[PDB]
Design an enzyme around this catalytic site. Structure first.
Site, mmCIF file in Angstrom:
data_model
loop_
_atom_site.group_PDB
_atom_site.id
_atom_site.type_symbol
_atom_site.label_atom_id
_atom_site.label_comp_id
_atom_site.label_asym_id
_atom_site.label_seq_id
_atom_site.Cartn_x
_atom_site.Cartn_y
_atom_site.Cartn_z
ATOM 1 N N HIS A 273 0.745 -1.303 0.218
ATOM 2 C CA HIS A 273 0.055 -0.010 0.002
ATOM 3 C C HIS A 273 0.734 1.442 -0.013
ATOM 4 O O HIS A 273 0.300 2.363 -0.625
ATOM 5 C CB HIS A 273 -0.917 -0.183 1.215
ATOM 6 C CG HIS A 273 -2.033 1.050 1.132
ATOM 7 N ND1 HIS A 273 -3.362 0.762 0.400
ATOM 8 C CD2 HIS A 273 -2.086 2.103 1.709
ATOM 9 C CE1 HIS A 273 -4.100 1.913 0.524
ATOM 10 N NE2 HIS A 273 -3.223 2.776 1.357
ATOM 11 N N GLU B 174 5.581 -34.383 -1.656
ATOM 12 C CA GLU B 174 4.539 -33.740 -2.398
ATOM 13 C C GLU B 174 5.099 -32.993 -3.394
ATOM 14 O O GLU B 174 6.272 -32.308 -3.389
ATOM 15 C CB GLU B 174 3.836 -32.841 -1.419
ATOM 16 C CG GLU B 174 3.063 -33.654 0.008
ATOM 17 C CD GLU B 174 4.149 -33.552 0.967
ATOM 18 O OE1 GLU B 174 5.095 -34.525 0.865
ATOM 19 O OE2 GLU B 174 4.092 -32.927 2.071
#
Ligand SMILES: CCCCCCCCCCC(=O)OC[C@H](COP(=O)(O)OC[C@H](O)COP(=O)(O)OC[C@@H](COC(=O)CC)OC(=O)CCC)OC(=O)CCC
Ligand SMILES: CCCCCCCCCCC(=O)OC[C@H](COP(=O)(O)OC[C@H](O)COP(=O)(O)OC[C@@H](COC(=O)CC)OC(=O)CCC)OC(=O)CCC
Ligand SMILES: CCCCCCCCCCCCCCCCCC(=O)OC[C@H](COP(=O)(O)OCCN)OC(=O)CCCCCCCCCCCCC
Ligand SMILES: CCCCCCCCCCCCCCCCCC(=O)OC[C@H](COP(=O)(O)OCCN)OC(=O)CCCCCCCCCCCCC
Ligand code: HEM
Ligand code: HEM
Ligand code: HEM
Ligand code: HEM
Ligand code: HEM
Ligand SMILES: CCCCCCCCCCCCCCC(=O)O[C@H](COC(=O)CCCCCCCCCCCC)COP(=O)(O)O
Ligand SMILES: CCCCCCCCCCCCCCCCCC(=O)O[C@H](COC(=O)CCCCCC)COP(=O)(O)OCCN
Ligand SMILES: CCCCCCCCCCCCCCCCCC(=O)O[C@H](COC(=O)CCCCCC)COP(=O)(O)OCCN
Ligand SMILES: C/C=C(C)/C=C/C=C/[C@H](OC)[C@@H](C)[C@@H](OC)[C@@H](C)CCc1oc2c(O)c(OC)cc(OC)c2c(=O)c1C
Ligand SMILES: C/C=C(C)/C=C/C=C/[C@H](OC)[C@@H](C)[C@@H](OC)[C@@H](C)CCc1oc2c(O)c(OC)cc(OC)c2c(=O)c1C
Ligand SMILES: OC[C@H]1O[C@@](CO)(O[C@H]2O[C@H](CO)[C@@H](O)[C@H](O)[C@H]2O)[C@@H](O)[C@@H]1O
Lengths: 125, 55, 246, 93, 385, 385, 93
Positions: free
Chosen positions: E202, E272
């Site tokens: 931001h 994985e």
């Protein structure tokens, strides 16, 4: 990398006939492949500006060129968002791809360098 | 499209109608899918096999 | 890795449940249970499968109730505190053949027959592997392969040497619906039944998948059209530069 | 409210850019534009533009890596077949 | 002023999601962030609802996941959404990070943004690890075993840390129960970290595909990007739905459908998929200690990029050599993953070692050398003397 | 600018904890807030660590807490801290709220601040309830039964909601397991609300005991209030340590040391001390539905104070009648709690009904009448016309 | 950032209070003060005065509530003793 450093190496090559005949062609090819001219931007318009040296330089840039830079930037974002290129007659030509900001950048860099040296000078009594 | 104008007339569909339509759509869509799905699998379902097994 | 160690790749058979829109063949599930009960149950458990799940899938409420009532289960002890048995019910799980691992290994030369409730999902190859294994036992191992005393050769099994011997032979079972009980037919049937044991939600999963994918596909195309509309003013925005007078 | 640091971006009305003069822009309401048909007119026609301009920067490294993979994959296959056990004993241990 | 700007709470929503000035030209690659937010929410919501039917005890863990699969209404949807969701979370984070690499998003003034991001990546991987352990399948046990043991490489206190992590003599009951406790915790820390990520984002706003200032032409987040993000939200959902209902197990390992066994490590063990490249890196070093260091350094080296990129322009859009090597890197990353999925065998071992070097050389050598060369090329290709 | 003010993250710490301008005259009653923050952290940390050894299974819950009590190193300290910590959390919260009523902290421009507070109060109570259920003692079971059944008062869908909250025919396995999952979840929701609470506090700053503007004389949060808060932190820790080590079960119930039994509600059943006042309110109504509504209205009526306080000055400092009636309210609340611990018997039933009436009359009748009267007293007592 | 909604409090330099003039404050460093060991004998009796201006606002209501409780508790005890069963049966149902 500082522009002073880039210029030092670049000038050296540009002054040497041997290196110049070897590198420049490859560089010309590189710039055409880069494609920023097809977006209507000059190389100096591509320099990341979020740093003090560039802010100093952009401040010092004369009014008229500053308005010109702004246009090329706005026109480019618009062209890029539509996923097109500008018509050829609007492409920046090699003659136009001038280092307009460079002198202001080198000037700002030299001043900061001196200021840094003076801030850290040693004294010999 | 006049088909749209006759129902909503240049206005966008309001929430109430959207929600109301969502409720109608769920029921109708489910039936249509189950119907298509079961028919595509005629002979394989248990209800079809249960009819076969009568002895 | 050598071919033997890898194990032979299982070919792709045309399972009627292969495909986004296909349910299981329930007649095949029902036939598969019979093969499990009459041929496999003696060595393999189906611990995660409760009787009540067979109802409405491969048997009626009555058929399952009767099947369950053939087995005994530990009941709540009497008023004196002594242990008592009771006939099984729909809430119970299909009883295994062995009381513990030790008894199981003893009845299988040290080997342990795994529970088959998830065998289809617990092995690379799925149905194709199970089917290929069950129908892939040659009469003799290939030339040069020395088989460990107590082992059986099966190309689809990694290593080639498996503790389970071929158990499926032509017409060892008599299907209730009059279907010729050949080895491959029985293999096809139990594998189908084992796939149901592992994925009982299959049929319902695919039905909801069709619904979900049609809605989302529509939603996706709709969102693109809507996006293009809200961006139309920006996408066609025109710019003109007239160098200001100094 | 406390004073936070300066950045290269501000907000509407003081964004942080240079002063703009001489640029005029024009736009037309989306409501006045042809009911979107640019999905199969200037999208499928102008399609493969982003492709033929950039594909080489992706294809050459893709091809280089795919070849290296296939080459090594086949060498492995040979090393583990009957015909390759001799070279396998060598290159391995 | 408008209530959305004056209200203490709404003004936050307004500044980040409504009036937020976006560069008019940010392409679809900038949609990955909103997608990661969706993933986190998906993961948390599905996890909590499953948590209601799960048991961490090492003896009831595996069966309770089976209980969710079979007995819980829509339970299989919850589990497949969670499991496949984790995979999509990593594919999207890989693209988000790659977008950052390609467009010089890591460059000043966005260095903190990048660093917090590296923090998030690490927490996300640790969270995924902890979650996988909770299933208590073969892969879970051995994964817990291998990964906790990573710390045994720390000299002196190494083995104590591992006994402390395990809470015993090996991965057992106290290990699974704390891992589930921790699995529940970290997602909330990541969220906290995401807020910090957005706070850094931001103050400087997003960058753009051109790599130059976006200050001259901004368009509000609301409508333009709220609707553009919706496009990718639906495509993400559509594809996740395809996997969840039609191919829910192709991204996992069948060994995790077998209850963990402390006495047998399956020969078919494979991490994985999203962890494969790092696994390959570690596997390339024939030394225990040096192996874990290099693997961890593979993540930390991402922190050096702001300093090794010598380019005077941000992003690869106008740089031929940088664009070519960026793809070498990406494809080298995929190959590292494929190597990870192979056995420790002759052709593969050397390839991994070579690919591992290419991975580090990109940040430490190729980027700084190529960027310096391009700076000079842009100069001599126009200036006359 | 100092780095603490310039940095994106530290600037938040600086504006809330360092340079925050505090009214020079706030007294020790304004130390409860920080103490509540301490309470939340104590609960979360002790809870996470215990969660590592807990089993939510209804067959294993009680024993798992006993396992923490006996087998876990320093585990009794975790539980006694967590358990007694809960009570302290409530005692400090009651004082925090009381402080508010007294000094008019609920009035403009701090109503949003107050409303968020009421929200937090409800969330904390629900959390504490869920927590108590996880022990699965005799009080746990019956508390779960009564409280979930509170929703059976909703017409038509009533019994359905209860069945849904239970996940079955009665409070059983599905209930205890989900209650643990939700017990872990709500504290993070409370933390988030606390941030919203602090955000609303910040734009207006704290009030002071004089009830007037503090803008003419502010002193920095740092040193002054950082060290003043430390005083109460140590006191809070000293008193809490006294219970944890010397009287761990004084604030509890012996019946919760007995495993839950679905067939026997002990005659000695009594709600946790901090819920007694609300429990007494419910018992005071001889009608099921009206009973639960009145009890819930007892919490919601706190939202009415900003409008029923007709006074032209904030706080009771200079108000004789308001100061008096404020204490009638405090002791009436305490009495309501005492009636709560008594059996439903003759003298007590009437006392509870009258005390319940006084509780509501305070907000709806006393405050507005008294404040109006005092407005006129301040006027005619000096204005000479 | 965006336009901030104005409240009744500001920050150092623009707190939101009225303009101050004519007021002078003086203070001495804590380092130059008596080592705070002068709490007793100098102002020990100053206490009590604080809790002598307030005790009645707390004590009377506490007294009112204490006796109400004591009175009801004794009645309960009587009602449930052999002697009270007479009145208990009447007042109860
Ligand atoms: C396994 C887990 C996967 C999970 C991830 C799922 C989400 C994937 C996100 C894809 C992505 O980020 O790709 C971005 C690139 C960049 O694209 P660009 O330069 O910004 O776009 C110019 C547009 O055409 C403008 O055009 P538009 O008017 O906005 O419509 C664009 C297009 C967008 O389609 C999408 O959904 C975007 C992928 O809509 C269509 O016409 C499609 C009709 C079927 O888009 C591409 O080039 C795609 C190839 C990589
Ligand atoms: C209950 C179980 C859980 C709660 C545990 C935590 C308890 C904390 C809550 C108590 C609280 O908030 O009390 C506030 C009152 C108001 O006080 P005040 O008007 O602002 O103070 C003027 C100071 O003496 C100035 O004096 P001081 O220079 O700041 O030293 C003050 C005093 C502070 O003592 C404390 O610990 C604060 C309560 O230290 C001492 O000299 C005495 C040491 C015993 O303090 C009181 O004196 C109470 C009056 C009824
Ligand atoms: C720890 C570190 C982790 C980091 C590892 C990297 C993550 C793994 C990679 C996964 C996918 C990421 C692909 C690269 C990321 C997007 C790249 C990008 O931003 O490309 C922009 C580019 C063209 O855009 P331009 O703006 O430059 O066009 C000029 C207009 N004047 O667009 C293009 O050139 C076309 C994009 C081509 C994408 C093909 C990707 C191939 C990926 C293999 C898929 C993996 C599955 C096995
Ligand atoms: C859902 C409903 C929520 C509300 C529930 C309320 C529950 C009660 C909370 C328990 C503790 C009560 C705290 C009292 C409230 C704040 C008291 C207060 O602020 O007192 C200030 C008062 C004098 O203060 P001044 O600021 O007016 O002095 C000005 C000097 N010129 O100084 C005094 O009055 C003296 C201090 C009084 C001590 C409080 C005694 C009551 C103790 C209760 C005992 C608990 C029994 C277990
Ligand atoms: C048609 C009925 C049967 C089916 C469907 C079946 C299926 C299977 C399957 C799929 C495996 C897993 C192999 C692997 O690890 O990949 C297996 C293993 C095994 N089966 Fe069976 N089986 C059947 C009958 C039997 C019988 C009757 C016995 C007991 C005499 C038996 C004994 C074993 C043993 C001991 C193993 C261990 C294999 C090993 O690890 O080497 N099976 N069976
Ligand atoms: C839970 C994970 C994450 C979330 C929710 C998240 C979210 C976001 C969002 C919403 C944006 C703005 C829009 C966009 O560019 O996509 C963004 C930008 C960015 N993020 Fe992340 N992010 C995450 C992880 C990461 C990671 C792991 C890194 C880096 C290692 C990273 C690096 C960046 C950078 C550099 C930008 C600025 C891109 C630019 O404007 O050029 N983020 N992120
Ligand atoms: C960033 C968010 C999260 C990630 C990346 C994540 C990842 C994972 C992964 C990879 C697994 C194993 C998946 C499988 O193969 O079955 C898992 C399991 C699990 N997760 Fe999470 N998780 C997240 C958040 C949560 C949350 C917040 C909770 C707790 C409320 C939770 C509860 C569980 C449970 C109950 C399991 C076991 C059931 C299952 O196997 O899916 N997860 N998680
Ligand atoms: C976990 C819960 C809570 C925390 C951590 C918290 C924290 C704080 C903090 C730090 C302050 C400033 C210092 C102080 O006045 O003590 C504050 C002020 C305040 N809080 Fe809370 N609070 C909580 C719950 C509540 C509740 C339940 C209410 C009311 C129903 C409430 C009402 C107020 C009010 C009105 C103020 C302003 C007081 C004034 O300045 O005069 N808070 N709180
Ligand atoms: C922040 C507010 C919290 C409050 C007010 C709170 C309150 C409570 C209460 C009243 C009990 C019963 C104590 C007893 O009589 O034994 C309890 C138990 C428990 N809580 Fe919490 N808790 C909070 C947060 C947490 C968190 C974040 C966790 C994390 C999982 C947690 C985990 C537990 C566990 C495992 C128990 C059971 C063991 C025990 O009896 O202490 N709590 N909680
Ligand atoms: C953590 C992040 C997760 C998600 C990030 C994605 C961001 C997009 C949120 C979409 C909100 C759209 C609201 C539009 C609005 O208020 O404008 C309103 C119009 O709203 C509409 O027309 C409704 C269209 C239907 C909205 C579709 C719902 C999206 C499905 C949710 C999936 C997200 C998980 C203002 O309209 P007007 O400007 O013409 O007067
Ligand atoms: C992890 C969280 C991180 C923390 C960031 C917080 C950001 C919050 C994002 C969500 C905003 C949505 C809710 C805002 C509600 C807007 C209405 C409002 O503020 O009205 C308020 C009153 O609100 C209430 O009484 C209750 C608020 C409860 C909020 C429950 C979530 C009016 O306040 P007002 O600004 O008009 O005050 C004027 C000065 N006297
Ligand atoms: C739910 C969350 C609620 C809100 C979250 C915000 C609360 C902030 C509390 C955190 C206090 C800790 C701040 C330490 C960071 C200060 C140093 C810093 O920001 O240096 C940063 C770099 O930081 C990093 O690389 C790592 C970020 C740390 C992540 C911490 C987990 C330098 O940033 P700088 O401000 O100097 O930028 C200008 C210089 N060109
Ligand atoms: C209490 C919390 C704890 C202990 C957290 C620990 C966090 C550790 C790291 O995260 C930061 C770690 C997850 C991360 O390393 C950086 C991964 C890339 C690790 C990659 C990884 O995976 C494997 C795996 O998944 C396996 O599955 C069956 C098996 C494995 O070997 C056989 C591995 C393995 O050899 C490696 C290196
Ligand atoms: C999934 C989450 C759910 C369902 C949460 C529900 C939350 C409900 C409310 O919280 C907001 C509720 C806890 C709150 O009511 C406002 C309390 C003051 C209730 C007070 C309360 O306690 C009792 C108690 O503790 C007992 O223990 C042994 C026994 C009880 O009777 C014998 C009670 C009782 O009769 C009442 C009224
Ligand atoms: O358990 C079967 C038993 O058969 C033997 C007999 O020598 O092996 C031969 O016969 C098996 C059954 O037909 C085949 O599976 C096996 O491949 C074949 O060599 C024993 O080795 C084995 O224990």
């Amino acid at each position: 990398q500082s522009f002073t450093s880039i210029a030092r190496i670049g000038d050296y090559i540009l002054k040497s006939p041997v290196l110049s005949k070897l590198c420049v062609p490859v560089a010309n090819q590189f710039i055409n492949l880069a494609g920023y001219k097809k977006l209507g931007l000059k190389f100096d318009d591509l320099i990341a500006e979020e740093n003090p040296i560039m802010q100093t330089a952009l401040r010092r840039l004369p009014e008229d060129e500053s308005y010109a830079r702004a246009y090329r930037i706005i026109r480019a974002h618009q062209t890029e968002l539509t996923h097109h290129l500008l018509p050829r007659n609007e492409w920046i030509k090699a003659q136009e791809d001038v280092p307009y900001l460079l002198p202001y950048i080198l000037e700002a860099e030299a001043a900061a360098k001196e200021k840094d040296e003076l801030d850290n000078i040693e004294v010999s009594k | 499209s006049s088909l749209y104008k006759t129902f909503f007339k240049r206005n966008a569909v309001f929430v109430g109608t959207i929600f109301a339509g969502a409720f109608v759509f769920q029921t109708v869509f489910d039936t249509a899918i189950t119907s298509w799905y079961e028919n595509h699998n005629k002979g394989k379902l248990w209800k079809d096999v249960k009819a076969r097994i009568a002895a | 890795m050598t071919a033997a160690e890898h194990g032979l790749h299982a070919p792709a058979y045309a399972w009627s449940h292969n495909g986004p829109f296909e349910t299981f063949d329930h007649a095949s599930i029902r036939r598969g249970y019979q093969v499990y009960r009459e041929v496999c149950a003696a060595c393999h458990s189906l611990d995660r499968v409760a009787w009540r799940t067979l109802v409405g899938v491969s048997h009626t409420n009555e058929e399952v109730r009767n099947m369950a009532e053939e087995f005994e289960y530990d009941d709540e002890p009497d008023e004196q505190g002594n242990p008592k048995k009771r006939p099984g019910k729909l809430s119970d799980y299909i009883p295994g053949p062995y009381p513990n691992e030790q008894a199981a290994r003893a009845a299988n030369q040290g080997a342990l027959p795994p529970d088959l409730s998830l065998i289809v999902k617990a092995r690379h190859g799925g149905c194709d592997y199970i089917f290929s294994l069950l129908t892939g036992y040659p009469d003799e191992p290939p030339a040069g392969v020395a088989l460990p005393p107590g082992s059986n050769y099966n190309p689809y099994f990694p290593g080639g040497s498996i503790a389970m011997a071929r158990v499926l032979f032509d017409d060892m079972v008599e299907y209730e619906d009059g279907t010729p009980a050949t080895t491959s037919q029985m293999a096809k049937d139990v594998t189908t039944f084992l796939n149901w044991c592992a994925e009982p939600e299959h049929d319902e999963r695919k039905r909801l998948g069709l619904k979900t994918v049609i809605i989302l596909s529509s939603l996706y195309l709709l969102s693109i059209w809507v996006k293009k509309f809200k961006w139309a003013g920006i996408k066609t925005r025109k710019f003109v530069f007239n160098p200001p007078k100094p | 409210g406390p004073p936070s640091g300066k950045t290269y971006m501000g907000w509407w009305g003081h964004m942080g850019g240079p002063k703009q003069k001489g640029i005029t822009s024009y736009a037309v309401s989306p409501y006045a534009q042809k009911p979107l048909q640019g999905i199969f007119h200037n999208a499928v026609f102008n399609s493969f533009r982003r492709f033929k301009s950039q594909f080489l920067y992706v294809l050459i490294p893709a091809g280089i890596y795919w070849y290296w993979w296939k080459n090594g994959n086949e060498y492995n296959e040979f090393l583990y077949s009957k015909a390759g056990r001799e070279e396998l004993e060598r290159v391995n241990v | 002023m408008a209530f959305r700007k004056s209200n203490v709470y709404l003004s936050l929503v307004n500044s980040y999601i409504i009036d937020s000035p976006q560069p008019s030209s940010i392409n679809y690659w900038w949609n990955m962030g909103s997608l990661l937010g969706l993933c986190l929410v998906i993961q948390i919501v599905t996890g909590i609802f499953m948590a209601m039917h799960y048991s961490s005890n090492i003896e009831l863990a595996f069966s309770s996941v089976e209980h969710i699969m079979r007995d819980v209404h829509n339970g299989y949807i919850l589990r497949y959404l969670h499991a496949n969701g984790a995979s999509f979370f990593f594919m999207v984070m890989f693209m988000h990070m790659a977008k950052g690499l390609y467009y010089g998003s890591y460059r000043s003034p966005r260095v903190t943004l990048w660093n917090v991001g590296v923090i998030i990546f690490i927490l996300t991987i640790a969270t995924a690890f902890l979650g996988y352990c909770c299933v208590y399948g073969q892969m879970s046990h051995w994964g817990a075993t291998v990964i906790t043991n990573l710390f045994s490489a720390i000299p002196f206190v190494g083995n104590d840390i591992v006994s402390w992590l395990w809470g015993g003599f090996s991965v057992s009951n106290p290990t699974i129960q704390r891992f589930f406790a921790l699995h529940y915790l970290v997602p909330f820390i990541i969220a906290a970290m995401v807020i910090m990520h957005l706070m850094a984002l931001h103050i400087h706003g997003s960058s753009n595909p051109l790599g130059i200032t976006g200050n001259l032409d901004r368009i509000p987040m609301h409508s333009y990007f709220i609707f553009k993000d919706l496009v990718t939200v639906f495509l993400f959902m559509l594809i996740l739905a395809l996997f969840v209902f039609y191919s829910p197990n192709t991204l996992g390992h069948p060994d995790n459908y077998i209850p963990g066994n402390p006495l047998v490590t399956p020969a078919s063990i494979v991490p994985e998929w999203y962890l494969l490249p790092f696994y390959a890196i570690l596997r390339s070093i024939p030394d225990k200690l040096l192996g874990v260091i290099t693997m961890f350094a593979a993540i930390l080296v991402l922190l050096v990029l702001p300093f090794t990129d010598r380019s005077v322009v941000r992003g690869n859009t106008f740089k031929v050599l940088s664009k070519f090597f960026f793809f070498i890197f990406v494809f080298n990353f995929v190959l590292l993953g494929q190597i990870g999925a192979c056995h420790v065998e002759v052709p593969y071992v050397l390839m991994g070692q070579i690919a591992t070097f290419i991975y580090f050389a990109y940040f430490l050598i190729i980027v700084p050398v190529i960027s310096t060369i391009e700076n000079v090329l842009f100069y001599i290709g126009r200036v006359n003397k």
